[PDB]
């Protein structure tokens, strides 16, 4: 059964800016993310992106402002051979108290896979809580202390 | 030292067929496999040098600020992924300028002419790139997305 990696976007795949990648000039890739995701794919992991984008589609974060950098990030990954099976987004504000905001598991219900060998990889405590809620492993990404080369090595 | 002298537009990234200049982020697109293949080439001992004509860069026809956004992002992607260019050599002149530095002229790479000529290459998509190689006394590889792409180059230049 399938090994999955459920991977956070902001602060994990790309750098976390006001916490919104709403301009092209705010886009920056995390070190080693491409070669390591390629390594992880070769080892048999399928990749799923999962992200909370607070207030996506509002005055404070229009969909168009999100789309440009996001679509470009996706181009870059895809052209280099990194493929995400799905990109799962919660667009809600915390105050909305919605059903889909990480660490709630709604976005990933369908997956609820080889649980023993699947991971959430993200840079926040809420990513680790998502792993607990899904009943799978959690890796707390840190650019300095638990980064892409380390994860690539560990999981292969 | 073995070097790869690599074109930018149409080689590392796609080249826009309207004005042939990446002056907006929506005109930036990486060529397939360029990142893993340059990493492979680096691991085999190649050093990388970027060499590019950017016609009219820094003038109203191609403002510096317009080039800088996509170019700096491109460079951030390379650097963050482990791809290091020793130098990025740019000719900003128009053809009519008759400058000393426009490819296939060798002025920009004069210091390299220094290197292992038998194992060094120019990689680019145009006749201009192949002519640069000849002018440098080294091999030229004509990049084509289908017939001589990044995976093929990665394999070819690491063949033992
Ligand atoms: Br790496
Ligand atoms: Br998040
Ligand atoms: Br894509
Ligand atoms: Br165009
Ligand atoms: Br590749
Ligand atoms: Br050129
Ligand atoms: Br050739
Ligand atoms: Mg994050
Ligand atoms: Mg070219
Ligand atoms: Na060009
Ligand atoms: Zn939500
Ligand atoms: Zn010039």
Swiss-Prot record, chain A:
The active site is at residues 8, 10. Keywords: Amino-acid biosynthesis, Cytoplasm, Histidine biosynthesis, Hydrolase, Lyase, Magnesium, Metal-binding, Multifunctional enzyme, Zinc. The keyword Magnesium applies. It is found in: Cytoplasm. Zn(2+) binds at residues 90, 92, 98, 100. Residues 1-156 are annotated as: Histidinol-phosphatase. Coiled coil: none annotated. Its main location: cytoplasm. One of its GO terms (molecular function) is histidinol-phosphatase activity. Mg(2+) binds at residues 8, 10, 123. One of its GO terms (biological process) is L-histidine biosynthetic process. GO terms for cellular component: cytoplasm. In the N-terminal section; belongs to the histidinol-phosphatase family. This is Histidine biosynthesis bifunctional protein HisB. The lineage of its organism: Bacteria, Pseudomonadati, Pseudomonadota, Gammaproteobacteria, Enterobacterales. The chain holds residues 2 to 163 of 355 of the full protein.
From Swiss-Prot, chain B:
Residues 1-160 are annotated as: Histidinol-phosphatase. The active site is at 7 (nucleophile), 9 (proton donor). It comes from the Bacteria. Zn(2+) binds at residues 91, 93, 99, 101. It is found in: Cytoplasm. Mg(2+) binds at residues 7, 9, 125. In the N-terminal section; belongs to the histidinol-phosphatase family. This is Histidine biosynthesis bifunctional protein HisB. It comes from Escherichia coli O157:H7. The lineage of its organism: Bacteria, Pseudomonadati, Pseudomonadota, Gammaproteobacteria, Enterobacterales.
